[PDB]
Amino acid sequence: RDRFYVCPPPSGSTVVRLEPEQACPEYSQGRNFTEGIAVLFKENIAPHKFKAHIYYKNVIVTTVWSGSTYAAITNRFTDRVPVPVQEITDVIDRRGKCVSKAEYVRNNHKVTAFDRDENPVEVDLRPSRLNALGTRGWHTTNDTYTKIGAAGFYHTGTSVNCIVEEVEARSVYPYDSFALSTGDIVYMSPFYGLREGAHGEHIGYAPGRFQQVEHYYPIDLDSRLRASESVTRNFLRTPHFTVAWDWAPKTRRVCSLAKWREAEEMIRDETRDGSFRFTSRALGASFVSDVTQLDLQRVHLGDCVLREASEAIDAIYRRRYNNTHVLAGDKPEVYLARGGFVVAFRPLISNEGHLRITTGSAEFARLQFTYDHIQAHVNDMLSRIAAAWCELQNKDRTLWGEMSRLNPSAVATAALGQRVSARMLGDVMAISRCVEVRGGVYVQNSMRVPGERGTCYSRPLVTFEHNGTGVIEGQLGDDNELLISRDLIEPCTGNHRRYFKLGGGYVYYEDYSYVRMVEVPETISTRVTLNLTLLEDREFLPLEVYTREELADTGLLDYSEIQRRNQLHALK
Amino acid sequence: RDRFYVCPPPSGSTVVRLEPEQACPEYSQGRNFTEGIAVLFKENIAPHKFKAHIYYKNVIVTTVWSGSTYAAITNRFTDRVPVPVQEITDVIDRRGKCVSKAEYVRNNHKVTAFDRDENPVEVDLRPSRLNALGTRGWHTTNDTYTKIGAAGFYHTGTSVNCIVEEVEARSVYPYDSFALSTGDIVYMSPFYGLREGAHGEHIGYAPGRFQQVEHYYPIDLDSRLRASESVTRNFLRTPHFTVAWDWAPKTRRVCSLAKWREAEEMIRDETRDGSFRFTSRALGASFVSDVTQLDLQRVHLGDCVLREASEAIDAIYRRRYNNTHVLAGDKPEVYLARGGFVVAFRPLISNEGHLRITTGSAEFARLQFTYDHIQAHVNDMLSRIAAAWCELQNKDRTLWGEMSRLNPSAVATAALGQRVSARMLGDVMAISRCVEVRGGVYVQNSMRVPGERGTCYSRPLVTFEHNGTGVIEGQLGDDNELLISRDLIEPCTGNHRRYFKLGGGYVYYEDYSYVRMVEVPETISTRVTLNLTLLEDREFLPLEVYTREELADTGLLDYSEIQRRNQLHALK
Amino acid sequence: RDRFYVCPPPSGSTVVRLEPEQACPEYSQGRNFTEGIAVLFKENIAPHKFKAHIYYKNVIVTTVWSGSTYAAITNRFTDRVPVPVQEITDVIDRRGKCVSKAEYVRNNHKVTAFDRDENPVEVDLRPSRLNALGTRGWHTTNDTYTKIGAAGFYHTGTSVNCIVEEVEARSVYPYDSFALSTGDIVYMSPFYGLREGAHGEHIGYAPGRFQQVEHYYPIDLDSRLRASESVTRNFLRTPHFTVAWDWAPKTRRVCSLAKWREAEEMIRDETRDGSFRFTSRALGASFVSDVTQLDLQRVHLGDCVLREASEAIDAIYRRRYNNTHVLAGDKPEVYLARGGFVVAFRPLISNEGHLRITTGSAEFARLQFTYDHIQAHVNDMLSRIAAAWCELQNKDRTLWGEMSRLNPSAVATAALGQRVSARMLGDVMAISRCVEVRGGVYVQNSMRVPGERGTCYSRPLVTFEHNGTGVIEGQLGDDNELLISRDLIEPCTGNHRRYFKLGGGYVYYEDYSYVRMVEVPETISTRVTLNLTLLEDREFLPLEVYTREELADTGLLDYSEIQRRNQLHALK
């Protein structure tokens, strides 16, 4: 049951016009780009690894007690002993042998020891047995001298094993000490020398123990050779051994940074208060930096950057671009991106202080990229929709001005969302409200004009009442509008069926006479449908591949769990 | 070649009306928020670190054999020995000296030893040499006594070094034992005492070894001092040394949780079956919890939470809000978020059991946030589009009712997507189909009415055939509709050019006479364009900064790789 | 101030028509799916852990010097010694005792030792004390024999402790050696045997040391038992102990892969150059693989896959699907997904070479999923919008053809975006431009026709000038169009107010006479509004829960930091 309406004639009391076309939203100028090739450098967490050699003699003095039926070991004193630098160069290198005696200082006292307690003779250096992921080694003896029995007392045997070993060395920042595959820590920089500016490294020893030998040629101790190309060799004489390694300039062996990824399709994009954004589609990562370059000089040991960067970058240019684009500037540009990454970037042109800790994750970089990508897209495509909508609104207004001629009251009603009565005062609209009536309205069976044959009424005659208890003669208009003056008249026609609107239902008229009240179960739609649905809630539960527990348990031995045990020998 | 159509007069057989305006989709009420300040706590994986002191005497009994030309070490027996608590307090503390003799029990036998094998005299405690990231230490001697020669036999020397060392201590959960910078594991809780409820900690020793000293004043052993403010000192007497550290209540030194991040702009939002969602724009993370608070009491050692939370939160309130907002409640609220994070949250008001394992990642938290953010946006803006579309469909229907007067057949055709013939029965539409004809249709050169001068035909005369082999006289209507009755007549005019539609092409008429068949290569469009493009496939390849291999190799020494080696002395 | 326009009569010089309806964009066929159940397998980084037993005798030979007032330990030589296999089986197993003497070879010499230096008697194996997370153990003695004094010389004591220990064993890839809870590395495969194809494992020993005992029954050494079900027992005789463990086939104990996650709602989807995409809503991860299955045979030790996969999968089918769906094929399908994950997938049907390194992250998998999800949605819903827009443009054209009858010039102007003059030549449009005039245009006070009473002019009379200095008589049209011929005439009416458009403002006329120049501050809009807003910039700052620093510091002891210290005994 929808309302009935009487529409008083619109006087020029209120005058309105049709809202004119509006200015339609523009987009943005489209971001400025800079194509190019970039290399990403992380903080170098890796230790410095070099090869080295150990020379030590293996002093074991065992004392046995022989008796009636048995022999028993009362003692076994092992101790390692340093082979002198000359003994290395003049005997082990030159001849491949080693003196079977070790004259060393222990407890600030010059002492000695003899293999088999016999006389000092030079012995051949034989290889070891072998392996299970183990390096090279050499020794002089296969056994350790002990006591020849004859029941009675305690004889004390003395063996001496001359050992040369290939060992892998390891120094971590700041490299003022290193360590050997054998567990032994050397309290000095592997870059210490006597050269230009080496002397300025760290030594934890008396300078007599340290000694450098230039133009050394590293003899290989199996199948001999020297061979080509000489080395400056470092010798350190410790209380328990001697170590020899190849000295080289610090600045050339280690870097604080380390090449991580290359990016052939790298894109830089500046927006807002000075901020570059390096993004790689291949990687799937975005890197926000400043616009100011990194003064690479403010980095302790960062020379490998420009080196290895110029290298890779050029390698790719040869490999992908050299017939289409050209390098920009001479050197590549260098920026400190967020999260401790270093970006060396050289732009592509078509022929037409403190040190950095890299987060062990670049998760932000990819979350950036991903959001930055979608955001870009939906913003573009929604701006396109916003623009078309306005253009469509702009064009549709030509249809509405035309209709405000034939029917300015219907226009005005739609626009205002309420039933108004309107009509044109030339180029403008005069407007008034519409007042409700009750359901107490009655229709008449006759539509034929009494006073005249031939001319009938077009639309039904009604007697509607101001309230629900009166009478006024008028006729029916469109959309339940009750008119007053009864001058909607047409000539009579044969074959005359008519339907008219009344509240909710309709009314039928055959041959200008009332008949019945109809339904309208049949409809017709000019509507274009648009079923959008919502994006659903998702639940991101914690997903780790490896927990930290598992990550620690990977090792064969746990030094904490073993000391934890071996101590409890308040026991077994 | 599109079709021709004959449209039989629409009788009231089928009656339809124009589908009325529809109810337009509303949005959601807009989510309810709760601004505020939050602190995030992770599971504390860090060990408990305290300072401590070691007191031990260094017993080395060496035996030498002197001879003709040499001396040789036959043995060297080192062993560490505990300094008694009284010797600490009465000699080392009080005087700064140490007895050069060590009376200890070994093999369940009271034994002793003398430095230089001489008489017990009190010796000054001198500092050590120094450093390379090494703490403080003290000793009494710089050398170790050995044998004075005179060729002949085996003399046995005995040295004793009194050593006090500053050591860094480390206890991990559940702290029922700790360990020292020197490698030594103490099988007891660092919180064990004799106080109120300490006695209930773990000891792996006989109570005689343990001893507490209240109102101790920690003398500093270089440049002396006691000094201000006393300590309850713990003394443990081990077989190889004595350790002294500061006892303090367990509940006050360690927590199971640990402050991770603060969030000044934290937002909580409840939706669906009881679920809060803490999100920080700064962080870039979302944290789903329950609505029930965490009973912090069900956590073993979780007191640092409310402490350090109330601290930071307040610090920020002073720093950002105290003139605009106000704290809510008294205490902050506490929730267990997904992934083992603890959220202490105190809302902002404008003046107007078991323990937790924190995932070593919060990746879910940020993936949540990111999806939760976009989803929010596209859902809003697509609902806005959906709403406007319906409102636009609602308003456009006023244009379609108007047109169903001038031309109800064109309306009805568009709506139904097929060629229908329709016309108004008052307020309703009567509808019929349209039937095809063949291409075998012919046009006539004349458009002039024969029977009358002055009046011509408006639209061309055609003789169309029901099939492709007949004849019926009719004339041409719009859009290739073939009419029947030939009464589309107008007065004749000079300057008369006309084009009419025929299949695909058109037909020209000059001065009411046939001429030729034209093309129409010129078009005009009322269309608003909308070029949307699709979002492209992206490929997220695995991107790790550091592999686990590199992550293990960071250490200077690998206890597994060294034992792996030292054992192979089935060798060198 | 907008322009005035004169519109020359449109001749047939330019003829155009209204652009016809266009073909509307279709969607895609909707992707093809394959529901099912999947299990995810990662690379197994875990070591192989088995139980084992150690048998060794504890030889400590101490030598004391007794004197006047004291006794002093001059030496203490500990050494571990292997218990023979027969002694294990015939004494320790059978009887639960152990001979108080150890006949071992040391320095390639058969030697012996006696507890208390007395005669060999069999002694009972007692339990140890206990614990602090420590396993079982047994020994024979609680003390170590030393010297009975009587002042004078150096007596040498000899104790021997028989020890059996329960130890936890650990082998890592490739398991050609293992290690014990006690720190001891055994250089041999735990799967070595003498069986079919075991003999082919690694041994670093002489075969005499190795010995296998079939149908062994593992006696438990406290409260005895054998008991049920026999074992093939391995015995290795090392220089310092004996180890016994249970041999079993290698292929059955270890796998190179390891079950990680299960997925009940797993979805596979093929698109483009052969690529599956396994996605789980629960997990929140997507896994791109090839279409070719993984030949599981090309994997060293990958048998646990099909085992444990068929297990879980079936368990779930019973648990969720068995009344709705059915398994597909017999065996499950197996694919190598990106990032080193293995996917075993068995489809669901409604009743109707080299080895793999798994990245310690699956971050790509979830970033994939997340982007892949949104991309899917916005692409769908934007295609829906694109489709409706075209359908709406298609239907609206029926309104524009109707209007090109009543007003073809207004249509043509909107469409062309410029002021044109047009009119119908039957079924086609003739078109011309419109030429500007100046603001120098004048309106006349009179609207009454002089020559006739009764008939007035409808729209104002103007004298507009080609330039800004002429005269031509015409009248005013719509939208500031200046006409020429003055034949817009109507009968005169009482109650006559009129507004007309002039540049920007309007002009009022009462009773067919000029009055004033009005404003139009009242407007009316047929516009549907659409306020879209943009998605805002987000900043993803680096967010780590635990830095690698913290991750290393978790351990009680650092073997690198302790050796680092203990060495500096160039000191204290």
PDB file of N, CA and C in Angstrom, chain C residues 14 21 30 33 84 94 164-165 190 194 271 287 298 325 379 391 399 419 431 454-455 470 475 496 512 528 555 569 571:
ATOM      1  N   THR C  14      28.530  16.293 -44.179  1.00  0.00           N
ATOM      2  CA  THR C  14      28.945  15.237 -43.284  1.00  0.00           C
ATOM      3  C   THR C  14      27.734  14.464 -42.814  1.00  0.00           C
ATOM      4  N   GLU C  21      25.818  -1.140 -30.730  1.00  0.00           N
ATOM      5  CA  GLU C  21      26.199  -1.904 -29.555  1.00  0.00           C
ATOM      6  C   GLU C  21      27.415  -2.757 -29.855  1.00  0.00           C
ATOM      7  N   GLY C  30      36.953 -20.373 -15.755  1.00  0.00           N
ATOM      8  CA  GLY C  30      37.006 -20.789 -14.369  1.00  0.00           C
ATOM      9  C   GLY C  30      37.978 -21.942 -14.257  1.00  0.00           C
ATOM     10  N   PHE C  33      40.168 -27.561 -11.034  1.00  0.00           N
ATOM     11  CA  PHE C  33      40.717 -27.944  -9.740  1.00  0.00           C
ATOM     12  C   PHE C  33      40.916 -29.441  -9.587  1.00  0.00           C
ATOM     13  N   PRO C  84      86.954 -56.507  27.536  1.00  0.00           N
ATOM     14  CA  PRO C  84      86.796 -57.506  26.467  1.00  0.00           C
ATOM     15  C   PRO C  84      85.365 -58.023  26.304  1.00  0.00           C
ATOM     16  N   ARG C  94      76.166 -62.335  32.346  1.00  0.00           N
ATOM     17  CA  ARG C  94      75.815 -63.604  32.985  1.00  0.00           C
ATOM     18  C   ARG C  94      75.738 -63.511  34.509  1.00  0.00           C
ATOM     19  N   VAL C 164      80.290 -49.526  33.599  1.00  0.00           N
ATOM     20  CA  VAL C 164      79.348 -49.708  32.497  1.00  0.00           C
ATOM     21  C   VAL C 164      78.383 -48.529  32.427  1.00  0.00           C
ATOM     22  N   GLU C 165      78.272 -47.908  31.258  1.00  0.00           N
ATOM     23  CA  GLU C 165      77.415 -46.737  31.135  1.00  0.00           C
ATOM     24  C   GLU C 165      76.406 -46.812  29.989  1.00  0.00           C
ATOM     25  N   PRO C 190      77.115 -46.970  12.178  1.00  0.00           N
ATOM     26  CA  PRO C 190      76.288 -47.717  13.131  1.00  0.00           C
ATOM     27  C   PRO C 190      75.458 -48.798  12.450  1.00  0.00           C
ATOM     28  N   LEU C 194      77.713 -57.769   9.192  1.00  0.00           N
ATOM     29  CA  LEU C 194      78.341 -58.802   8.386  1.00  0.00           C
ATOM     30  C   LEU C 194      77.259 -59.468   7.569  1.00  0.00           C
ATOM     31  N   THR C 271      48.025 -24.487 -14.428  1.00  0.00           N
ATOM     32  CA  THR C 271      47.936 -23.395 -15.393  1.00  0.00           C
ATOM     33  C   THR C 271      49.294 -23.150 -16.044  1.00  0.00           C
ATOM     34  N   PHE C 287      52.524 -23.958  -3.294  1.00  0.00           N
ATOM     35  CA  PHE C 287      53.715 -24.696  -3.693  1.00  0.00           C
ATOM     36  C   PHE C 287      53.743 -25.068  -5.165  1.00  0.00           C
ATOM     37  N   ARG C 298      65.292 -41.820  -7.317  1.00  0.00           N
ATOM     38  CA  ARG C 298      66.475 -40.998  -7.545  1.00  0.00           C
ATOM     39  C   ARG C 298      66.910 -40.299  -6.263  1.00  0.00           C
ATOM     40  N   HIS C 325      33.753 -38.812  -0.198  1.00  0.00           N
ATOM     41  CA  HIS C 325      34.709 -38.923  -1.294  1.00  0.00           C
ATOM     42  C   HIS C 325      35.423 -40.269  -1.299  1.00  0.00           C
ATOM     43  N   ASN C 379      40.868  -9.585  -9.631  1.00  0.00           N
ATOM     44  CA  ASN C 379      40.749  -9.864 -11.059  1.00  0.00           C
ATOM     45  C   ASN C 379      39.351 -10.333 -11.441  1.00  0.00           C
ATOM     46  N   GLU C 391      27.650  -3.822 -20.648  1.00  0.00           N
ATOM     47  CA  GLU C 391      26.234  -4.143 -20.765  1.00  0.00           C
ATOM     48  C   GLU C 391      25.391  -2.904 -20.521  1.00  0.00           C
ATOM     49  N   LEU C 399      18.363   4.577 -25.346  1.00  0.00           N
ATOM     50  CA  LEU C 399      17.913   5.895 -24.918  1.00  0.00           C
ATOM     51  C   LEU C 399      18.472   6.989 -25.818  1.00  0.00           C
ATOM     52  N   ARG C 419      30.084  21.847 -29.690  1.00  0.00           N
ATOM     53  CA  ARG C 419      28.774  22.341 -30.143  1.00  0.00           C
ATOM     54  C   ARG C 419      28.566  22.130 -31.635  1.00  0.00           C
ATOM     55  N   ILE C 431      25.492  16.747 -40.062  1.00  0.00           N
ATOM     56  CA  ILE C 431      26.196  17.433 -38.981  1.00  0.00           C
ATOM     57  C   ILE C 431      27.002  18.637 -39.451  1.00  0.00           C
ATOM     58  N   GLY C 454      -2.386  38.907 -29.390  1.00  0.00           N
ATOM     59  CA  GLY C 454      -2.715  37.514 -29.155  1.00  0.00           C
ATOM     60  C   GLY C 454      -1.534  36.564 -29.249  1.00  0.00           C
ATOM     61  N   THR C 455      -0.754  36.673 -30.319  1.00  0.00           N
ATOM     62  CA  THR C 455       0.421  35.824 -30.470  1.00  0.00           C
ATOM     63  C   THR C 455       1.667  36.565 -30.015  1.00  0.00           C
ATOM     64  N   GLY C 470      28.688  45.187 -35.034  1.00  0.00           N
ATOM     65  CA  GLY C 470      27.739  45.024 -36.130  1.00  0.00           C
ATOM     66  C   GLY C 470      26.292  44.881 -35.674  1.00  0.00           C
ATOM     67  N   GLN C 475      16.762  35.553 -32.705  1.00  0.00           N
ATOM     68  CA  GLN C 475      16.280  35.338 -31.349  1.00  0.00           C
ATOM     69  C   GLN C 475      17.035  34.228 -30.630  1.00  0.00           C
ATOM     70  N   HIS C 496       2.302  35.116 -16.539  1.00  0.00           N
ATOM     71  CA  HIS C 496       3.444  34.773 -17.374  1.00  0.00           C
ATOM     72  C   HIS C 496       4.776  35.209 -16.776  1.00  0.00           C
ATOM     73  N   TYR C 512       5.485  38.938 -20.546  1.00  0.00           N
ATOM     74  CA  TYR C 512       6.102  39.140 -21.858  1.00  0.00           C
ATOM     75  C   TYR C 512       6.931  40.418 -21.956  1.00  0.00           C
ATOM     76  N   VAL C 528      24.504  10.326  -9.330  1.00  0.00           N
ATOM     77  CA  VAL C 528      24.822   9.311  -8.353  1.00  0.00           C
ATOM     78  C   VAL C 528      26.277   9.488  -7.954  1.00  0.00           C
ATOM     79  N   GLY C 555      73.056 -20.956  24.284  1.00  0.00           N
ATOM     80  CA  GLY C 555      73.768 -22.063  24.897  1.00  0.00           C
ATOM     81  C   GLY C 555      74.483 -21.728  26.194  1.00  0.00           C
ATOM     82  N   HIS C 569      96.577 -18.459  29.834  1.00  0.00           N
ATOM     83  CA  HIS C 569      97.554 -18.901  30.865  1.00  0.00           C
ATOM     84  C   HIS C 569      99.058 -18.718  30.476  1.00  0.00           C
ATOM     85  N   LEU C 571      99.814 -16.357  31.911  1.00  0.00           N
ATOM     86  CA  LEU C 571      99.152 -15.569  32.993  1.00  0.00           C
ATOM     87  C   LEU C 571      99.061 -16.153  34.438  1.00  0.00           C
TER      88      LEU C 571
END
